[PDB]
Structure 1
């Protein structure tokens, strides 16, 4: 890792560009994309082949973690100039980058796929083919102790099969089709070895996908700081060896007593809030705090944490550590 600003010249100061404190952290509008035609399913072999030439860059200087390397992929898509246009997804990536910089995550290599022009550090356009190959890039070199970070802000929708699948929409989905959640799970999760940690944040207002992960916890309205939350199993079987954690937003599962909000940006506010809390709180306590923040800011969604193992929610939240397993969950 580069540990001095004289080593490779000046690096980005995303905090200094106002990306932590001077951009909107409010909900933004996300109109549902219609049902899409069948996608082109991913050939994982081709993806990993097309990834061998690829590389990221070190986005800032930070203190390196002994025995660990950090890699990150950020995808933000505004679909400029189309009926799919969204105002806040590239801004979500801005906030994610500035928060990681502020908290000093020592990223060795980052790839930034955004469709915003003049975006410092942008690697390439978030097309179907770039998303696929850079997803493979993120996981391809992973060795014990490694830490991977993934963030997507853009449309989530449904697509037909050759009944419907959940999917994400690349910037060129009109020409190239979407990427189904099964394929994302295969690219990002299924090829991790043991002892590698990944955190994946999906900010999709209109897909409830948890990327096929076996355990989940929704921090709904009736949860309290003086309760003891646990994850639950929602799928039989598991093909993930690594420690994958996913943050997304979903509908509150508490039934309302009823007898304005915004849909875009919740998952990004959730993870950035979690990181900006400076107190080394547990997953469980921290999710309560973020739930309260989301409600206060008029987001529609509550936090949803999903994982490849039943995480003991008394464990301290981090992006870098392997999970302590809740043995009470089969």
Structure 2
């Protein structure tokens, strides 16, 4: 059962109290491009699920249980301290993610936190290639109808050579162990969910645009209005995802600029998008919330606009949530 009292297993983290909601930067940070990488070691999903046996998370805070549902979460933040790859804001993104989920009362049964920041309360382990792979398997391995899964990554996205380039993420030990290709992330995180499981995945990568091979997407570009009726669009033939996967990322505005012939930051946009969506206390639809969120990113000088991708065409009139299955937009084949 979920721990419902602070006297049950002792005191738990108060991330809001450590200033992680209100007293850390929510501004853009600099993300230098990593550059083209050598070929990665492709994932053996068998070995991943084997290495995940016996892994577990911990309950990060007390909250009100959702009847008929469990919640599992994996957070990955990578600053690449001391290297040419160093990023200032990725572990801070995870701080804000954790504090926002706590503030809003998401009842997480088990969380795993992979960050390279020292003295980070609740840190499970280092975000190495092998840890990311096995804990991705951990997140999805026990999934049953009604379950809710949450995934957050803030770190480098880049390209790696094949054995045409692949999009990939860089673990903290990428220099030794190589990157993880988006196809393998899709196979670990998305492909192995059964029906009636809900996942939300947030990828905060300054230089990717990748949508993890999902079949439907919606970009909340500059010409969208609250008085319009947005829809997702199909961008890939075929689909191997049974569950309800929703992904938040940032991408370039698809509206063509009126500039003919200001300052921004590329880091932190996806995290601000999801946290802004969660902090809005008015039970807005996906569509309306993405407008407000787009406006926040342009106000705060982020380079990116919001991108929502999914395993089904979500009716954007549906109320945004982390916990509910999608209402399908039947107009999108």
How far did residue 303 of structure 1 move? 0.0
Report how far residue 57 of structure 1 moved: 0.1
Cα offset, 1:115, TM superposition? 0.0
Q: Displacement, 1:97?
A: 0.0
Superposed CA offset, 1:133-166 (max 9, x none): 0000000000000000000000000000001000
C-alpha distance in 1, partners of 2:227/2:209?
A: 28
CA deviation vs aligned residue, 1:15-43 (integer Å, no higher than 9, x gap): 00000000000000000001000000000
Cross-structure match for 1:180: 181
Q: Distance in 1 between matches of 2:96 and 2:277?
A: 13
* Cα RMSD (Å): 0.2
The residue that corresponds to 2:220 in the other structure is 219
What's the CA shift string for 1:65-118, capped at 9, x where partnerless?
000000000000000000000000000000000000000000000000000000
Residue 323 of structure 1: aligned partner: 326
Please list, as runs of the form range in 1=range in 2, the aligned pairs for 1:182-221 lying within 5 A after superposition. 182-221=183-222
Structure 2: distance between partners of 1:41 and 1:209: 18
State the 1:329 CA deviation: 0.1
Give, in whole Å, the separation in 2 of the partners of 1:211 and 1:192.
15
Displacement of 1:53: 1.1
Q: Within 2, Cα distance between the matches of 1:210 and 1:136? A: 19
State the alpha-carbon separation in 1 of the partners of residues 207 and 319 from structure 2. 30
How far is 1:302 from its partner? 0.0
- Which deviations, in whole Å up to 9, do the C-alpha atoms of 1:170-190 show, x marking residues without a partner? 000000000000000000000
SS across alignment from 1:83: coil
CA distance, structure 2, for counterparts of residue 275 and residue 52 of structure 1: 32
2:148 matched to which residue of 1? 147
Alignment TM-score, normalising by the size of structure 1: 1.00
Separation of aligned partners in 1, 2:197 and 2:26: 31
| Structure 1 position 299 matched with structure 2 position 311 | no
- What residue is the counterpart of 1:56 in the other structure? 57
Whole-angstrom CA distance in 2 between matches of 1:300 and 1:29: 11
Report Cα offsets for 1:171-223 as digits up to 9, x if no partner: 00000000000000000000000000000000000011100000000000000
- Secondary structure of the corresponding residue to residue 92 of structure 1: helix
Question: How many Å separate the matches in 2 of 1:18 and 1:190?
Answer: 37
> Which blocks of at least 5 consecutive residues in structure 1 are unaligned?
none
Instruction: Map residues 237-252 of structure 1 onto 2, 5 A cutoff.
Output: 237-252=238-253
Q: Distance in 1 between matches of 2:37 and 2:52?
A: 27
Number of residues paired by the alignment? 330
TM superposition score normalised by structure 2: 0.99
Distance in 1, matches of 2:42 and 2:119, equals 32
**Moved beyond 4 Å, runs of 4+:** none
CA distance in 1, matches of 2:239, 2:268: 29
